């Protein structure tokens, strides 16, 4: 209840869509200023004006204020198309990549530096754990000097079964050996971390697929950090060329208002995301269900 992750976005539509409907008459003027209040809304959390843009018209080419057939409440309608309107904003529009129960699902982790990626490993390791699966950790990470103590000592945190090196040092050969080990000992949930001291996308993008194509991973899952507001745009769209099964995971929702924004720009490149960062805490990590987040929201 406006307690979410997108709360100052949350208070902002909700007294636009509180206002509209005790208005005691509604009509076009009465609808046009609570489209700027929501439009402002929307572009204060750092959403592309274009996509704003086409909210607004959206919003207005579904009401038809003009001919009211009988049976329709606008008010209540108006406030729909918006809430119809504000997940299709965050809605990539395309079925995730889900696990098949009894298969071998080997899941690869991309990340810029600064990205919470080798925590977010973790998360969704635990996720997994929790709902029954049989889940693993591999650390694929050269040059970190520290990164396979980070996993040693985070799957020590859920318990997971770990597999990675210290003195090894070609990253492909430490996760063929690790989907290698797991996938005989029958693991259905085999997740693999890369490394993480990468500034540039060009450079991601290298190790990203001289590790895909030696364990062959059935899904591969991009960790942006939400903090850079609409510009997750760029990333977005350029992490989706470039894999055959692309996943999005948005963590540092908080403790800024460019989250909203960030949503909508790897929603309109229709890259899936599947989960969210929400906080610092291991449970603190929940999958992107559209409709469920929108109506929280409001």
């Known amino acids: 209840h406006h307690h979410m992750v997108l709360a100052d976005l949350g208070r902002k539509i909700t007294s636009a869509l509180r206002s509209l409907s005790n208005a005691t008459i509604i009509n076009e003027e009465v609808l046009n200023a609570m489209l700027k209040e929501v439009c402002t809304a929307l572009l204060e959390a750092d959403v592309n004006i274009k996509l704003v843009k086409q909210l607004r018209e959206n919003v207005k080419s579904a009401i038809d204020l003009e001919e009211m057939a009988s049976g329709l409440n606008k008010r209540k309608m108006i406030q ?12 990539p529009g395309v079925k995730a990549w889900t696990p098949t129960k009894g298969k071998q699902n080997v899941i690869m982790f991309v990340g810029l530096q600064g990205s919470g990626k080798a925590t977010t490993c973790s998360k969704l390791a635990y996720y997994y754990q929790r709902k029954g699966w049989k889940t693993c950790l591999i650390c694929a990470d050269t040059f970190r000097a520290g990164a396979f103590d980070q996993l040693k000592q985070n799957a020590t945190k859920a318990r997971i079964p770990f597999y990675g090196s210290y003195t090894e040092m070609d990253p492909v050969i430490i996760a063929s050996e690790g989907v290698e080990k797991f996938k005989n000992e ?5 997740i693999v971390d890369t490394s993480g001291r990468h500034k ?3 450079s991601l993008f290298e190790e990203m ?5 030696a364990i062959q991973p059935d899904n591969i899952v991009y960790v942006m950090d939400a903090s850079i507001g ?3 745009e760029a990333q977005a769209k350029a992490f989706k060329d470039k894999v055959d099964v692309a996943s ?7 403790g ?3 989250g909203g924004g960030a949503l909508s720009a790897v929603a309109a490149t229709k890259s ?6 929400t906080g610092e805490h291991i449970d603190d990590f929940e999958p992107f269900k559209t409709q469920p987040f929108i109506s929280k929201l409001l």
């Open 80 to 91: 729909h198309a918006v809430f119809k309107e504000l997940v299709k904003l965050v809605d």
């Open 186 to 190: 029958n693991f259905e949930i085999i």
């Open 200 to 202: 540039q996308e060009d």
């Open 209 to 213: 697929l001289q590790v895909a194509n």
């Open 230 to 232: 609409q510009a997750c």
């Open 248 to 254: 999005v995971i948005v963590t540092k929702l908080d």
């Open 256 to 258: 800024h208002a460019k």
């Open 272 to 277: 899936p995301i599947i989960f969210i960062g």
